[PDB]
Amino acid sequence: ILSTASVLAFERKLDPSDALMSAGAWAQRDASQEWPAVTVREKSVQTVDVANLPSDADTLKVRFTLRVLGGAGTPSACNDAAYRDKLLQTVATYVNDQGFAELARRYAHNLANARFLWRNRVGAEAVEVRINHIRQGEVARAWRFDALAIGLRDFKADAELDALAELIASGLSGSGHVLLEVVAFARIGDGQEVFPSQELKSKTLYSVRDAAAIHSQKIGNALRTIDTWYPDEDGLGPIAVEPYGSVTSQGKAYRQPKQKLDFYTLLDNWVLRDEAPAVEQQHYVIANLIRGGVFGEA
């Protein structure tokens, strides 16, 4: 029969740390070690929470660590062992078809452009991303990208980029452990208001310990924005890899289930009836398996 398992929990791959922010000056980012972090402040307008840079700063210092785990096709809790074996065979067949080539390149793009800087990148005239490869506590290999050249819409190539792509692909395959400290540097302006992820004093801004921060799941949703294989209209760029391709800004869901392009129909075509989809659709399927989920029937 080979039905879908009743429980199909998948862990998140590419675990993001809780991204802080901090303030400082451009051309002092080489000495960006003891930079003072911005703080959530209550201001009476009714009182609301605001976060902004001080007077003697124009650059943000969003820092988070990303861990590439591997074993993307392996579920954490699968009800059926035959379905788990068939799905592992299908994911391994995908790996022999391509060894996490395009997915790691697009994830290296979402690292390379500061899409994790959601609203801290729109008003910035100079955005910079620094990625250190921490291995046994030391910087194995450093990278210093530029989000101005690497656009948020097109999907290009660059040599250090491909180096980051092979590193993320080796992490996703399982041939090693990849831990990347990513520090952003956006010239948002002198004392301009920044946008941390907001907690729910009508509205509060989330922090960790005397220092404002961005949520991990915001960084994860920014990293998942590789999906361009949806039936795109009206000139929309990449969307986040979600089940049934939904975006909150447009209020609509691409990859509609009335079409045969949502993630679950592509899974049941790929691993149950052996109807292998296109290369782009299986790229999207493996990206959704990388992000994790609670997949399964009821």
Partner 1 sequence: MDHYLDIRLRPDPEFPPAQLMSVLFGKLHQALVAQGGDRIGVSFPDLDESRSRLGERLRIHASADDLRALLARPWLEGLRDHLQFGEPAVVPHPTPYRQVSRVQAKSNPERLRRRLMRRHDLSEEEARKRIPDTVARALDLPFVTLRSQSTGQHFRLFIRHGPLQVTAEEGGFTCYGLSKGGFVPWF
User: Would you say 1 and 199 are in contact if contact means Cβ atoms under 8 Å apart?
Assistant: no
x/- map, 231-260, partner 1, by CB under 8 A: ---xxxxxxx------x-xx----------
- Smallest gap, in angstroms, from Cβ of residue 270 to partner 1? 26
Q: Return the C-alpha torsion angle 145, 149, 154, 155, nearest 10.
A: -30
* Closer residue to partner 1 in complex, CB, 95/126: 126
Instruction: Single out the residue of 76, 4, 87 nearest to residue 285, CA to CA.
Output: 87
Answer yes or no whether residue 124 interacts with partner 1 by CB under 8 A.
yes
Q: Exposed/middle/buried for 66, CB within 10 Å: 0-12, 13-18, 19+?
A: buried
Instruction: Single out the residue of 267, 226, 246, 278 nearest to residue 110, CA to CA.
Output: 226
Q: Return the C-alpha torsion angle 179, 185, 188, 192, nearest 10.
A: 70
Q: Which of 9, 152, 253, 272 binds partner 1 (CB under 8 A)?
A: 152
Pick out residues in 166-195 that bind partner 1 (CB under 8 A). 189-193
Answer yes or no whether residue 219 interacts with partner 1 by CB under 8 A.
no
* Closer residue to partner 1 in complex, CB, 45/159: 45
* Closer residue to partner 1 in complex, CB, 192/204: 192
Question: Collapsing DSSP states into helix, strand and coil, what is residue 291?
Answer: helix
Number of residues located near partner 1, criterion CB under 8 A:
30
- What are the φ/ψ torsions at residue 178 (nearest 5 degrees)? -115, 120
x/- map, 71-110, partner 1, by CB under 8 A: ----------------------------------------
Answer yes or no whether residue 54 interacts with partner 1 by CB under 8 A.
no
Answer yes or no whether residue 121 interacts with partner 1 by CB under 8 A.
yes
